[PDB]
Design a protein around this ligand. Structure first.
Ligand SMILES: CS(=O)(=O)c1cccc(-c2cc(Cl)ccc2[C@@H](Oc2cc(N3CCC4(CC3)CN[C@H](C(=O)O)C4)nc(N)n2)C(F)(F)F)c1
Ligand SMILES: [Fe+3]
Length: 271
């Protein structure tokens, strides 16, 4: 039997200091329903400092590390959505920017959704995003997603039509699929959207969001010390997704158009 899956965007409704603060964010996400403006947050001074460190250090790296599509959209976000060292962008603002650019929108989320539920969001061009800020003790890498990761890792590529299409298609393929198919698609997502490298004018560049928000892993990924294989869905889908550490291997796509084509061939075989 086919599992429940959303048929319209609203069906996604059916999917000590620091701890106290995290509960505040978790409630904002839990109370949200489709159609609501995403609640705006007044960030603390410490939170803004953490953002500023992350933002300043990553922006020194992007020109030499990030793919061209990332770099194209990054300045648009400083102009329209308040991306600056001294200001944490709001999810509602970013959501409205994306809706105009590619039809993508944001929903706040408290922590992880299942891979099935997360991917189902992408089918409607909805990206579930956290709103809290990583703990100030390690700005350079965090093992759980935070708003810095969403805003600097994901958003600039969600604003690119080719990438938005690629992402949506992973979601669309997942809807009502078998457990095994969802796992394979989630793994493909992990090694493209989350931790992908691509080749542009012969150089290795970064498009993975998890790399683009981690000062330390971004540098590691292009350092020459990392293992690197071609993106090939039938092989890549078998690779373990790790969380404690830097990735043991990265996959290299040729372009967003090519990765999209490879996923189209692949998803035929898992229907
Ligand atoms: C999106 S999906 O639903 O298709 C999917 C695919 C594969 C696995 C999972 C999944 C699901 C659950 Cl319920 C729990 C955990 C995971 C995976 O965890 C993560 C962590 C994850 N982070 C964690 C946080 C950083 C960024 C990336 C790492 N450093 C960054 C930084 O410092 O800024 C932030 N990103 C993904 N996609 N999955 C795990 F299996 F553990 F690796 C989800
Ligand atoms: Fe992510």
């Amino acid at each position: 039997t086919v599992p429940w899956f959303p048929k319209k965007i609203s069906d996604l409704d059916h999917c000590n200091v620091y701890r106290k603060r995290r509960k505040y964010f978790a409630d904002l996400a839990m109370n949200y329903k489709h159609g609501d403006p995403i609640p705006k947050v007044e960030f603390t001074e410490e939170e803004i400092k953490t953002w500023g460190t992350v933002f300043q250090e990553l922006n020194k790296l992007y020109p030499t590390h990030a793919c061209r599509e990332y770099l194209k959209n990054l300045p648009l976000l400083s102009k329209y959505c308040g991306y600056r060292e001294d200001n944490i962008p709001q999810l509602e603002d970013v959501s409205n920017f994306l809706k105009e650019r590619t039809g993508f929108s944001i929903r706040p989320v408290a922590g992880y959704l299942s891979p099935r539920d997360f991917l189902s969001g992408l089918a409607f061009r909805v990206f579930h995003c956290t709103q809290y800020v990583r703990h100030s003790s390690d700005p350079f890498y965090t093992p759980e997603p935070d708003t810095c990761h969403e805003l600097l890792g994901h958003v600039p590529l969600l604003a690119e039509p080719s990438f938005a299409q690629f992402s949506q298609e992973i979601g669309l393929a997942s809807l009502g699929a078998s457990e095994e198919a969802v796992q394979k698609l989630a793994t493909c997502y992990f090694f493209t959207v989350e931790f992908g490298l691509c080749k542009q004018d012969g150089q290795l560049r970064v498009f993975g969001a998890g790399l683009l928000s981690s000062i330390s892993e971004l540098k590691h990924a292009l350092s020459g010390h990392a293992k690197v294989k071609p993106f090939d869905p039938k092989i890549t889908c078998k690779q373990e997704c790790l969380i404690t550490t830097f990735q043991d291997v990265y996959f290299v796509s040729e372009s967003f158009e090519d990765a999209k084509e490879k996923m189209r061939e692949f998803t035929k075989t898992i229907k």
